[PDB]
Amino acid sequence: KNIESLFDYSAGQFEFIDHLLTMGVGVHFAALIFFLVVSQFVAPKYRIATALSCIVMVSAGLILNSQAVMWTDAYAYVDGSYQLQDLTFSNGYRYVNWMATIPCLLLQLLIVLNLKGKELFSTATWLILAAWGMIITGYVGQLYEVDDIAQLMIWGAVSTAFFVVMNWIVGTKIFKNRATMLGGTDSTITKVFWLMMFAWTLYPIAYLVPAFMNNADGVVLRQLLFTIADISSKVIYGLMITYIAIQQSAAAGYVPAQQALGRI
Numbered sequence: 001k002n003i004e005s006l007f008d009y010s011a012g013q014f015e016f017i018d019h020l021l022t023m024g025v026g027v028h029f030a031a032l033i034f035f036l037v038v039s040q041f042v043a044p045k046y047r048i049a050t051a052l053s054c055i056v057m058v059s060a061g062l063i064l065n066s067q068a069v070m071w072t073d074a075y076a077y078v079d080g081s082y083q084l085q086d087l088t089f090s091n092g093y094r095y096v097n098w099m100a101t102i103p104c105l106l107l108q109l110l111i112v113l114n115l116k117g118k119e120l121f122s123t124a125t126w127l128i129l130a131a132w133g134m135i136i137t138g139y140v141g142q143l144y145e146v147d148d149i150a151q152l153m154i155w156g157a158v159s160t161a162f163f164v165v166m167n168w169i170v171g172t173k174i175f176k177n178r179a180t181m182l183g184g185t186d187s188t189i190t191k192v193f194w195l196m197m198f199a200w201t202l203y204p205i206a207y208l209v210p211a212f213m214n215n216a217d218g219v220v221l222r223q224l225l226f227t228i229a230d231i232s233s234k235v236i237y238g239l240m241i242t243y244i245a246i247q248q249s250a251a252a253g254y255v256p257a258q259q260a261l262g263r264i
Ligand SMILES: *C/C=C(C)/C=C/C=C(C)/C=C/C1=C(C)CCCC1(C)C
Pocket: 098, 101, 102, 105, 134, 135, 137, 138, 139, 156, 159, 160, 163, 200, 201, 203, 204, 207, 230, 233, 234
């Protein structure tokens, strides 16, 4: 069902994909240690936002690790190239994991936006429903990336509709609650919005790779786009969320935050 199964891979193509996934594991678990240590400098009001980054680091890191082992399990060097064996490789597990990681990325944004109570519960509910609609329709579409490209594009259009509506909720909440943010993070949160628009858009681009580059080099390109998008949407994004959480904690008088920012 996946275009990965259609091709043999040169030693260079196979080893580069292996190193891309392995490097992605190292980056996420290295960042995990950072968010863990820094969490003690976050005020209790925002500490959930930094803990969610730790949850995203292990969740994304485990999928990248699972993809890397599946990649080496599925292919062996036979007659001068890496060829498919018994076990299969698939990108579908990324979609299943997004069902958990995307709500975590959205929740930590709502936390540093100083949303509370019923507006927090209502906004998160609509964001998660829009995200799940996007992921499920996209998962169904990529099942047809070999057998029915036309069906992959129609499911992608439905998924893009959820994507655009989700981004409109995110943008509306950011620019409406930007005024409530402390320590100059009202400026920083606008860059987080544009980082999200850039990084999250890489995923539909990779989703369309079977339509404009259905060959072994397109397989490499898709994993490369996934690596750029994962690092930007989770690691860099989490580093900006954590900075915003620390800066607002210090502005609100949290002494550990003031001492942490003061020592650097
Ligand atoms: C850390 C993982 C993230 C931020 C995943 C983001 C996923 C998306 C933004 C989903 C994108 C899709 C569309 C925009 C329509 C085509 C199918 C979906 C999955 C790829």
